[PDB]
Amino acid sequence: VSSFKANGNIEAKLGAMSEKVNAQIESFDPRTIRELELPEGKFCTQRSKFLLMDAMKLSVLNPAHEGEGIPMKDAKACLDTFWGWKKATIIKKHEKGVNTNYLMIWEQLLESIKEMEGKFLNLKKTNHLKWGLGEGQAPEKMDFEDCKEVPDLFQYKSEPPEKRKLASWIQSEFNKASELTNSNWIEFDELGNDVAPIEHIASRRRNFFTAEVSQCRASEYIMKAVYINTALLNSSCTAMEEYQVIPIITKCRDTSGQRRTNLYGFIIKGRSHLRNDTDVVNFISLEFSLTDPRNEIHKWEKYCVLEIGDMEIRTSISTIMKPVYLYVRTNGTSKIKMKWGMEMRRCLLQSLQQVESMIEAESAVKEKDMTEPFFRNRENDWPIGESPQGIEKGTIGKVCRVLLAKSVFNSIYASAQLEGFSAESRKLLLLIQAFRDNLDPGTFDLKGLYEAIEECIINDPWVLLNASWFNSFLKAVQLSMG
Amino acid sequence: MDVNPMLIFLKVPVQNAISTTFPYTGDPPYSHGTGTGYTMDTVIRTHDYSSRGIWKTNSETGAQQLNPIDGPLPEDNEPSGYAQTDCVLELIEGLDRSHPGLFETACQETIDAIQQTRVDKLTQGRQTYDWTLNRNQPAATALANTIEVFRKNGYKLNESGRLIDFLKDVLLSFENDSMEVTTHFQKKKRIRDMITQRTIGKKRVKLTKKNYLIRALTLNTMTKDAERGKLKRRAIATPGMQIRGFVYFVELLARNICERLEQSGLPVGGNEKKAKLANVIKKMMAKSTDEELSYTITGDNTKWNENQNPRIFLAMVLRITAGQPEWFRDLLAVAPIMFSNKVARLGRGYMFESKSMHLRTQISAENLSDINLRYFNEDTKKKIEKIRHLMVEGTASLSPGMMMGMFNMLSTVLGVSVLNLGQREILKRTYWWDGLQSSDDFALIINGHFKEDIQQGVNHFYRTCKLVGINMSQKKSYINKTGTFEFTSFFYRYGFVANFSMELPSFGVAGNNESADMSIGTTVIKTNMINNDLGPATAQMAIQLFIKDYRYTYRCHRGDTNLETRRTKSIKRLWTETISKAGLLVADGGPNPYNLRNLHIPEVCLKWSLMDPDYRGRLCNPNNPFVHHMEVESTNLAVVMPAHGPAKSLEYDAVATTHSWTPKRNRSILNTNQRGILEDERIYQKCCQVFEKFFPSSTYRRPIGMASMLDAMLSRARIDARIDLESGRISSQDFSEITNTCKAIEALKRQG
Amino acid sequence: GMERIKELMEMVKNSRMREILTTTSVDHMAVIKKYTSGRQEKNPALRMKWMMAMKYPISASSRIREMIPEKDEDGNTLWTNTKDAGSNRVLVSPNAVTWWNRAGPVSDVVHYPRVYKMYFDRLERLTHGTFGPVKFYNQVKVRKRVDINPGHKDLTSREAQEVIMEVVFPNEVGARTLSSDAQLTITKEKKEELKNCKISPIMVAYMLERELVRRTRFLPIAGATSSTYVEVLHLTQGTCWEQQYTPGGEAENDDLDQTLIIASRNIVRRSIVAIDPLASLLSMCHTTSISSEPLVEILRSNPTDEQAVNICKAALGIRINNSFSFGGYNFKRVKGSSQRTEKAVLTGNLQTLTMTIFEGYEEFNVSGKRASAVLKKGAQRLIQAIIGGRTLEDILNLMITLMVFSQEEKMLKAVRGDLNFVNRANQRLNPMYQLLRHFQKDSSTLLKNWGTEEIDPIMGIAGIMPDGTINKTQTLMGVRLSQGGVDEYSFNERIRVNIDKYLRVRNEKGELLISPEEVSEAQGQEKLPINYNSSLMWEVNGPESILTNTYHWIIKNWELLKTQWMTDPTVLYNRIEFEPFQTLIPKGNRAIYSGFTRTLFQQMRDVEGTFDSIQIIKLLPFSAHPPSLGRTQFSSFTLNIRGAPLRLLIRGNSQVFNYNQMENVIIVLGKSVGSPSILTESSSIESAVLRGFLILGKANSKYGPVLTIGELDKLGRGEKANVLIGQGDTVLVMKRKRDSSILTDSQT
RNA sequence: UAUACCUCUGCU
RNA sequence: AGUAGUAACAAGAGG
């Protein structure tokens, strides 16, 4: 090594090497490339921990009784606004589950809520509830030497997920997540006094966001998830053995400026002796909803729905009575998942930073605070949706909510598939942008990337929707370009 | 109308709106069970990429060791371990010409460092594999347990204190035929009340040469949790305590090289890296002519660790150090040698379930050799059959390939030398190149006259890379004209653009303590406003959301608000009792003082003006029991894990209040057989606690001394008591007491 | 201190720990101090969310059981007897901390703000700091290294460690005496500051370590780089906005001296391009305000000996010292002058380096510290150096500094070891200071490479040898020792000096001292913020800002300028808004670069069909200068930004000037300047590219082989050929038969 | 063996 | 059942 002196060894040994070792550049063109192969099979299921568009609000105007601070006394006040309870009747079967238990759990819940007094409610350990929360379902741990020769002893099912097909419900969920409502869901904590001129402009600009965000339906889901998960983590640590009831609450303010407390349903917690972050607490989601499950049967594949009551609703013209459905579902969440559920409020920043950067991008070149002439001077000049006519453009306020909804749905439908897809699709997105910048782009192995992208797209509804959105973008480029 | 956010990219460029592509607001993917399945796959791929290499069996280890270096040249684009020593030695020579005297000055700095550095230094860092207890332990304890056995045996050169003297013992420790090691053991008993109670004791066990040497060259394995930008999980690794000491100096040598290299992306930090990149692009346009096509390839190397062979690193070290003293060459050469003959422990093992019986069971990693293949599935049992060939003392020998990010710095030096080869004057072709390398990721920039010349160049790079075990990922990488690129998640579009979504995970409760988290969370917003272009209003929001996150997390809701939590009862008592409401810290249910301008001031110092003299007295009482000062260098240091990064310790500015408290330790070690290590710690910490009464300085600067702790304290006590006698305010009878006590202690020392 | 020895007696009584106290050494104690069964927290954000739900999450010292009650007034349990894992500490409730703060023991904290002074200063700077208006524009940030630690006492970590040790642990210092007088003062200052202050010494050490030592980082800064302004980077600047602000307390004198030089230099460099420079300089001088204080009153009071500053002082009629500093010592030119030629040279370290070499005979008078000399210097040649001082150390230190100042090939080719002329982040460094700091640490290689000379035996003029000997026969080449020193004070005397229209500085005798050519064009960033309130200067200066503001203003008023380009173009060329751009162009090229442009603009007017508004906007500011008629081809124009020669290509997009057709916007230096109208525009014919030529689409093999731009001279009028134009593009070109020309409306 | 309680642990 | 996805949780350990 000390005595070595080079004699073109690289230059000689390069020529001796085979010509099959090479990095050939396949010139990239968006019009030449194909679309993403979406996976085929059964239709995809609603995997979220609570109901998004379909949920029903049993609301109460303003404070009442010693509740408000106390969680169950909010739910008691919310239940008293509805008087139309039938005897429970199963109308959509959870195909794999023993559906008699789901009816008994709701009846035991509604019985226990009536009979309870005080602040907290631990349900009694009954064999129908034990099934729903998975009592004793853990096999007992033993030494290998104690049970060597057992016939069916195998490792745990170390297999890939079952492939699913894209459905229309996930797109509609996003459409509805993007929309506005009459309730300001987000409430911000206090701030310091605005002394610096920039802090006044920042507040003025923050007020336009505050309106556009707080009124969005995505915020309703954020506040829901935050409450569910914050309450669930605190219960999971303190009440490890007890089957606690946790209501689904979101306190809001109307566009009039009046207070309101909405109730969506109940969550019965299971045993929460959580070793690692990934270890699960099984819970039973019981949620109110007006939508019929038999019209879109694939969406609710894991749910068991009960027709529990009836109520009056006033249409724009008519006044039509309808039945209420209680969507019951055995589910499970982990410390890591509910922890990130607690921190969902940061979804606003991903949107608002991106919106603010687009405002500040124009502000610099225009030499003026473009804050007000973006929101106030309404112009449809950002492509955010695709209708039967073509590609519809929207405003900075629409962009805010559209980008918020994505940020929320990324948090709700959080998975390895999304994580893997997002990283690899970005490379193709960057190639399209490098072509559209006119930088003569190229790839060493295009179809190898496609395989790495398509490997990720398996069963997650959100990943499947993003994968379709990528194709919708890809075609939308191709049509506009050539 | 159907909504589609990715349509934004029609109007807005992808780089300018790159934040929307990262879905980092949700939870990351965690690996649930054991990494044994992934480890074996890594072990198999490493040997599979080196398959055409020459096998051999080790004289001491008795392990099958595959030797691909100087093997047959590969004739396909698949990943290859078949590197060529004469090419590497030409690259390293080519680096030395292009950077004259660089190796000399870098070596001379390492020479000083070796003679200078203490054993104390090796306590710093991430968890290492403690061969004493056959598991991962914190770096400090691994060292202490290694020194325990070393000193219990004949190897006590480390008593000097200097690192080089400890490294002397490490090589001698292989000469012991039967290495005596003490290990914990459980023991049942019967104690009345009648209770059957257990207690833990000691057990002397001897390890033969095979048993020791294989444990010294063991790298432990785990799974990489929370790894974003990926689908399937990964298998990370952890080094032994013997090899650890040498790697430090080899990385330190490499660092001194890399710091001075134009094309090195390490060890520089965030903005410094962004500057160092942005400058080489301007350097390239300075170097090139007007009538040249410049193409920037956004590189990424496939299986970076598994291809590059520790025999190549031995060649690199020996060639870089050529000219220096033979002790220094040999000393640095140790780590490549230890890596080249290494073994790999295969995690915890596997878990079986029985559907009919309804029972589960954990099987050991050592039992993978002695077990029927009916239990495992086709993919697994195929791997078990493969791993049995490499199995020695219950561990698989990974002779070829590097395990994980260990030699990063020196690994970069190999990649830089290829970028160095691309100089116009060195090549003398129609094409030439320059760029940047930082371990696995790299950015190349080729220049020529026609795209023929660029293609010619890219091949000359790619094939030269292959010749030395660098393997470009043809899937992930992509080329375009110079103007846009990506590099370690920094996105360049005629200039580096903001990627805010990368930092989002930091915007929350850090989880250290009330006083710290406030200082962190506010500085997180501050720093993101400068670097990552967090706009004023969104920054204002970030404060409002962080405060609300902070209140809910620590249960320190503002005193007036009517929420039901354990603390609010005691917080109300303060809130009502306090005169000035703005004086109260948020941690004690006060108001949020912060806004854009205030972010750089600590809460305590900010509210000092508005504070209540009674409050600020109690809050900042130095005699409180909540704070726990240990050492100056560790003071005001939290630990935070970002989205893309290994592990970071962050500094924070805050006043030493009662809110600077430490939370409870994990108490699961009470149940297990390591129960004594808790008791040892009580003795060790309280032994230092008493020493620190005699020598206060030890908390600031490390106490340097070869003499005994007792002997140091006794010598201090005698002289302190005499200085307090003669000039000071202590009586002759009080002096006598001390000296007589010291004399008694001196006897009680000698009696045992 | 009897408690501790009685505690140690009881420690030694136990056999298990007397083992540890005797066996483990004082070196090895640092290992067992950090010995713990617990390991570092992996996800603390989660673990705190988890633990704060628990009843007793916090740990605290065993003596908490003494200090606070077990059950609090409202009926919450404050502490328990269950101990923490491997500690004497006990698990307690967060109600304990809340209890302590309302009901616990009150403690004196009058000395607290002196320990944390570093933090409290930040509140003082914000409280007494003043706000101004918000400007909205493309904030051109620059990645530079700056100070993060305002109010530091300039010390290294080693220097500060001694000082801290002597304050907090005076009894247990090693052998290290406080070497510097700065240390000795600070040690006494900080001792009386924190006298009888009850607080943990550990905290004081940390606070003093952070307070004393300089701490720096790489940040993106636009304009002000002083530590008091870096402190509030988040508040001062953004992506598109500049919040005007000046913090409380008086600024540093070195920074005010530094920024003055930059301001003066910018004002001088701006004035050279304008007509009637003296009046422009006077106009700028009265308007300019450094950190809310007019430049004129600062120039009167400041003692800063600098060329560009002395030009400003001469216009305002202030006392002037014709001098400039270098490596501590000040240099005053007595006789002669030199042109500042730019010629690249190889070092002895084998590194190519573009240097600004000073070519011409000059006699300098030199002084400072404990030394002084008379230097006589030419183009890379030290003729003579008569040095004198108090110590041989300071004489030799100056000798080295002068031997560096000479720029001889002798010293350059004796550079040994490692010495890069670029930063750890590949930034261009000052070579002269790098050489100086290298050679002041390592002299031996220079001295032996320098050579010796025979001395005339004169009683007074001694010789200095290459081993530092005071020899009377031999000496170093040109170096002479003055045994009685050198007479001085006449050096320091501030002269009454005159100035002409074109900023040449004439002494009362009637001879030139300082010329605008001598002023260095070192486009450096400023410590304190300069505010030029002039129409001549832009809102904020700095070479990168000039390119963006110049091209932005063209696009801003493009409809006015486009009509002015077609009809009456000479007024468009001689507009005063294009002057600040000319400072970016090299002084030699300015004339030929404008001439090359004007003809390409008239070629565009002559030929029908070809009209590229992008090509006009790109090249428009280069036109604003009296043109030269010399026919030479240019593939690109060079521009000096912070020393770095950035090349703007004539045809197509460039690094400097880019037009992204996707965005439809001009990106200057990675910053959007504006959108222009190009629907009907664009053709295969290109006029404004080559002088007396027209590009006609892509190349055609049946007009011979491709050619370079240099080969265009050998072609007939009307004839065609293939040319490799730029960025690897081969295009068909035709030599047009007609020519074009314009007469200017200006003088000399 | 089975059902009760009772003890430790929630990153080890 | 359910979470979950290449391997686990559905408490673990002890009288």
What single string gives the DSSP state of each residue in B161-220?
-BHHHHHHHHHHGGG-SEEEEEEEEEEEEEE---EEEEEEEEEEEEEEHHHHHHHHTEEE
Paired tokens of A201: 């402009």
Cβ distance C250 to C259 under 8 Å?
Answer: no
- DSSP run (H or E) holding B439: none
Three-state DSSP class for residue A287: strand
User: Cα-flanking dihedrals φ and ψ of residue A307, to 5°?
Assistant: -85, 95
By the 10 Å C-beta count (0-12 exposed, 13-18 middle, 19+ buried), C337 is classed as: middle
B670 CB neighbours in chain C (<8 A) are 85
User: Cα-flanking dihedrals φ and ψ of residue C202, to 5°?
Assistant: -50, -45
What does DSSP say about strands B235-238 and B293-298: parallel, antiparallel, or unpaired?
Answer: unpaired
Distance set, CA C571 to CA B707, C404, C562, C625, C680 (Å): 87, 49, 12, 12, 28
Residue with tokens 């409202």: C74
Would you tell me which residues 546-585 of chain C have a C-beta closer than 8 angstroms to some C-beta of chain A? 552
Paired tokens of C592: 């030929």
CA distance B322 to B336: 16
Q: Are A429 and A371 found together in one domain? A: yes
The answer to whether position A149 is within a domain reads no
The answer to whether position A12 is within a domain reads no
Cα torsion C163, C167, C169, C170: sign = positive
Paired tokens of B689: 């606690």
Paired tokens of B723: 């200085």
Residue with tokens 């040690």: C187
For B470, half-sphere exposure in the C-beta direction (CA atoms, 13 angstrom radius) is 27
Q: Are A108 and A222 found together in one domain? A: yes
- Annotate C509-544 with DSSP letters as a single string: TS-EEE-GGGS------BSSPEE---SSS-SS-SHH
Enter the DSSP assignment of B28.
Answer: P
CA distance C586 to C593: 10
Q: Are A303 and A416 found together in one domain? A: no
- DSSP run (H or E) holding B448: strand B441-448
A18 CB neighbours in chain B (<8 A) are 73-76
Cβ distance C138 to C552 under 8 Å?
Answer: yes
Centre a 10 Å sphere on the Cβ of residue B394 and count the other Cβ atoms it contains.
Answer: 17
For residue B499, give the chain A residue with the closest CA: A354
| Short-list A444, A442, A15, A12, CA closest to B301 | A444
Residue with tokens 């400890």: B166
A20 CB neighbours in chain B (<8 A) are 75-77
- DSSP run (H or E) holding C432: helix C431-441
Resolution for this PDB entry, in angstroms: 3.9
Distance between alpha carbon B303 and the CA centroid of its chain, in Å?
20
User: Cα-flanking dihedrals φ and ψ of residue A92, to 5°?
Assistant: -150, 115
What does the radius of gyration of chain B's CA atoms come to, in whole angstroms?
30
By the 10 Å C-beta count (0-12 exposed, 13-18 middle, 19+ buried), A139 is classed as: middle
Helices (H), A5-62: 9-16
Type of residue numbered C153: K
For C208, half-sphere exposure in the C-beta direction (CA atoms, 13 angstrom radius) is 26
- Nearest 10 degrees: Cα torsion B3, B5, B8, B13: -160
| Short-list C46, C677, C251, CA closest to A337 | C46
Three-state DSSP class for residue C133: strand
Question: Any known ligand binding at B301?
Answer: yes
Experimental technique: X-ray
Residues just before a chain gap in chain C (C–N exceeding 2.5 Å) are 676
Per DSSP, what are the bridge partners of residue C241?
C136
CA distance C556 to C567: 19
CA distance B170 to A458: 51
Paired tokens of A14: 């390069």
Q: Which nucleotides of E are covered by protein (CB under 7 A)?
A: 1-15
Q: Are A395 and A479 found together in one domain? A: yes
- DSSP run (H or E) holding B624: none
Q: Are A211 and A224 found together in one domain? A: no
CA distance A160 to A163: 9
Three-state DSSP class for residue B78: coil
Q: Are A379 and A461 found together in one domain? A: yes
Q: Are A126 and A263 found together in one domain? A: yes
The answer to whether position A10 is within a domain reads no
Q: Are A229 and A106 found together in one domain? A: yes
The answer to whether position A397 is within a domain reads yes
Cα C298–Cα C303–Cα C305 angle in degrees, nearest 5? 115
The answer to whether position A356 is within a domain reads yes
Paired tokens of B589: 């249910």
C43 CB neighbours in chain A (<8 A) are 277, 336
| Alpha-carbon distance B727 to nearest alpha carbon in chain C (angstroms) | 15
| Short-list B464, B111, B102, B471, CA closest to B263 | B102
Helices (H), B599-731: 603-607, 613-619, 675-694, 709-726
Cβ distance A144 to B367 under 8 Å?
Answer: yes
Indicate yes or no: CB of C243 within 8 angstroms of CB of A336: no
- Annotate B531-560 with DSSP letters as a single string: SS---HHHHHHHHHHHHHHHHHHHT---TT
Residue with tokens 């068909």: C732
For A213, half-sphere exposure in the C-beta direction (CA atoms, 13 angstrom radius) is 28
Q: What size, in residues, is chain A?
A: 482
Q: Which of A304, A321, A342 is the last residue of a domain?
A: A342
Q: Answer whether any strand E atom is within 7 A of the Cβ of A335.
A: no
- DSSP run (H or E) holding B485: strand B484-487
CA distance A87 to C591: 96
The answer to whether position A117 is within a domain reads yes
The answer to whether position A9 is within a domain reads no
Task: Write the CB contacts of B26 (distance below 8 Å, at least 6 apart in sequence).
Answer: A340, A410, A411, A412, A413, A414, A418
Per DSSP, what are the bridge partners of residue A55?
A289
CA distance C366 to B142: 62
Cβ distance C463 to C475 under 8 Å?
Answer: yes
Centre a 10 Å sphere on the Cβ of residue C387 and count the other Cβ atoms it contains.
Answer: 25
What helix, strand, coil percent values describe chain A, rounded to 5? 40, 20, 40
By the 10 Å C-beta count (0-12 exposed, 13-18 middle, 19+ buried), C379 is classed as: middle
Q: Are A337 and A405 found together in one domain? A: no
Question: Any known ligand binding at B750?
Answer: no
Distance between alpha carbon C452 and the CA centroid of its chain, in Å?
39
What does the radius of gyration of chain A's CA atoms come to, in whole angstroms?
27
Cα C229–Cα C233–Cα C234 angle in degrees, nearest 5? 145
Centre a 10 Å sphere on the Cβ of residue A57 and count the other Cβ atoms it contains.
Answer: 15
| Structural domain that includes position A296 | 44-137+216-342
Distance between alpha carbon B132 and the CA centroid of its chain, in Å?
21
Paired tokens of B148: 């325990």
Paired tokens of C130: 């003043």
Q: What size, in residues, is chain B?
A: 752
Q: Which residues of A109-133 are buried (b: 16+ CB within 10 A; e: fewer)?
A: bbeebeeeeeeebebeeeeebbbbb
User: Cα-flanking dihedrals φ and ψ of residue B712, to 5°?
Assistant: -65, -45
Distance between alpha carbon B489 and the CA centroid of its chain, in Å?
20
CA distance B746 to C600: 98
- What is the CA B372 to C1' D8 distance in angstroms? 36
| Short-list B433, B217, B201, B169, CA closest to B343 | B217
Q: Which nucleotides of D are covered by protein (CB under 7 A)?
A: 8-12
| Short-list C674, C656, C649, CA closest to C664 | C674
Nearest to B591 among A190, A339, A360 (CB): A190
Centre a 10 Å sphere on the Cβ of residue C130 and count the other Cβ atoms it contains.
Answer: 10
Task: Write the CB contacts of B562 (distance below 8 Å, at least 6 apart in sequence).
Answer: A68, A69
Nearest to B663 among C51, C87, C172 (CB): C51
| Short-list A353, A277, A330, A427, CA closest to A105 | A330
| Short-list B168, B329, B132, B342, CA closest to B245 | B168
Centre a 10 Å sphere on the Cβ of residue B457 and count the other Cβ atoms it contains.
Answer: 23
Paired tokens of C177: 């005496």
Per DSSP, what are the bridge partners of residue B637?
B651
Cα torsion C435, C436, C438, C440: sign = positive
Cα B410–Cα B416–Cα B422 angle in degrees, nearest 5? 160
The answer to whether position A436 is within a domain reads yes
Distance set, CA A438 to CA A424, B184, B483, C658 (Å): 22, 68, 10, 12
Per DSSP, what are the bridge partners of residue C526?
C224
Q: Are A299 and A412 found together in one domain? A: no
Indicate yes or no: CB of B6 within 8 angstroms of CB of A470: yes
CA distance A170 to A464: 9
Centre a 10 Å sphere on the Cβ of residue B687 and count the other Cβ atoms it contains.
Answer: 21
CA distance A125 to A268: 12
Cβ distance B89 to B69 under 8 Å?
Answer: no
Q: Are A414 and A455 found together in one domain? A: yes
Q: Are A79 and A227 found together in one domain? A: yes
Q: Answer whether any strand E atom is within 7 A of the Cβ of A253.
A: no
Q: Which residues of B397-406 are buried (b: 16+ CB within 10 A; e: fewer)?
A: bbbbbbbbeb
For residue A479, give the chain B residue with the closest CA: B10
Cβ distance B129 to B220 under 8 Å?
Answer: yes
User: Cα-flanking dihedrals φ and ψ of residue B223, to 5°?
Assistant: -100, 145
- DSSP run (H or E) holding A50: none
Task: Write the CB contacts of C431 (distance below 8 Å, at least 6 apart in sequence).
Answer: C353, C355, C421
CA distance C118 to C211: 6
Total count of domains within chain A? 2
Question: Any known ligand binding at B300?
Answer: yes
Distance set, CA B572 to CA B513, B614, C99 (Å): 21, 17, 11
Q: What size, in residues, is chain C?
A: 748
Cα B323–Cα B325–Cα B327 angle in degrees, nearest 5? 140
Cβ distance B709 to B692 under 8 Å?
Answer: no
Cβ distance B716 to B745 under 8 Å?
Answer: no
Cβ distance B45 to B402 under 8 Å?
Answer: no
Task: Write the CB contacts of B650 (distance below 8 Å, at least 6 apart in sequence).
Answer: B520, B637, B638, B639, B640
What does the radius of gyration of chain C's CA atoms come to, in whole angstroms?
35
